């Protein structure tokens, strides 16, 4: 649900403290919409895709 | 040598350091050094002696 | 998910701590002129030329984190 608050604990060596966050939601329509992200790489390996 | 890789650290049930969480990369040589077994999977502690 | 054969009874055998014996000095600093532990360029190569390159490398001559393993306790066979 919207306004949800989440949290978790942290190990002592990483500086202590508790990690906290808040989340929000968007409802569905009849048809589902999604997001795509394209990134291409040139010199990592042999040019082969 | 056999390696463990992870982004989350912690202490064990008796507080001993070495406990990790969530997905973890495990490297294990085997086959008298001929094989290089590896997996990015979930490790779960055992509750025995 | 993948195929993994399952384990047996969960009595883990006894484990010691003898790091005092493990404390031995075999320091081997790395020699860049000897060119050991030197990454290659990821996708290209050259031949018979000197070239400056920016990337990932170790410092010259570090003592590092030399650890070892050894056999356990044994009484004959
Ligand atoms: C690699 O390149 C070097 C120089 O860039 C070449 O070395 C020269 O070789 C000639 C012929 O043997 C000599 O007359 C020069 O004095 C050398 N120059 C030096 C040593 O600076 C070398 O021959 C090349 N290697 C190959 C296989 O062609
Ligand atoms: C060895 O382990 C892998 C991964 O758990 C498994 O896929 C394979 O079947 C095992 N082989 C034998 C002989 O148990």
Structure tokens at A23: 């989340």
Measured CA to CA, the distance from residue C33 to residue C35 in angstroms comes to 5
Q: In this complex, is the C-beta atom of C47 within 8 Å of any C-beta atom belonging to chain A? A: no
Ligand 2: which residue has its CA nearest to atom 14?
C5
Torsional sign, CA B47, C2, C6, C11: negative
Which method, experimentally, gave rise to this model?
cryo-EM
Measured CA to CA, the distance from residue A8 to residue A15 in angstroms comes to 14
A21 contacts C20 by C-beta, under 8 angstroms: no
Q: In this complex, is the C-beta atom of C40 within 8 Å of any C-beta atom belonging to chain A? A: no
Q: What is the CA radius of gyration of chain B?
A: 13
C27 contacts C66 by C-beta, under 8 angstroms: yes
> Does an H or E element contain B39, and which?
strand B35-42
Comparing CA positions, the residue from B21, B17, B23, B12 lying closest to residue B47 is B12
Structure tokens at C26: 């075999």
- Give how far Cα C30 sits from Cα of A16, C25, C34, C40, Å: 36, 15, 8, 16
Structure tokens at C48: 């018979």
Q: How close does chain A come to C46, measured CA to CA in Å?
A: 15
Exposure string for C41-77, b = 16+ CB within 10 A, e = fewer:
eeeeeeeeeeeeeeeeeeeeeeeeeeeeeeeeeeeee
- Final resolution, Å: 4.4
Q: What is the CA radius of gyration of chain C?
A: 22
According to the 3-state scheme, what is the secondary structure of chain A?
CCCEEEEEECCHHHCCCEEEEEECCCCCCCCCCCCCCCCCCCCCCCCCC
């Amino acid at each position: 649900e919207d306004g949800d608050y989440y949290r978790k604990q942290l190990s002592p060596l990483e500086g202590g403290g508790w990690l906290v966050a808040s989340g929000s939601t968007v409802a569905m329509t009849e048809q589902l919409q999604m997001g795509f992200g394209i990134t291409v790489q040139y010199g990592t390996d042999t040019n082969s895709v | 040598p056999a390696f463990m890789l992870g982004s989350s650290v912690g202490n064990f049930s008796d507080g001993k350091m070495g406990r990790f969480f969530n997905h973890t990369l495990v490297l294990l040589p085997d086959g008298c050094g001929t094989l290089l077994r590896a997996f990015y999977c979930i490790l779960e502690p055992r509750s025995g002696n | 998910v993948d195929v993994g054969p399952d384990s047996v009874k969960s009595a883990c055998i006894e484990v010691d701590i003898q790091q005092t014996f493990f404390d031995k000095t075999w320091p081997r600093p790395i020699d860049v002129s000897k060119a050991d532990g030197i990454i290659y360029p990821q996708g290209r190569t050259y031949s018979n030329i000197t070239i400056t390159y920016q990337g990932l490398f170790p410092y010259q001559g570090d003592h590092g984190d030399m650890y070892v393993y050894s056999a356990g306790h044994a009484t004959g066979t």
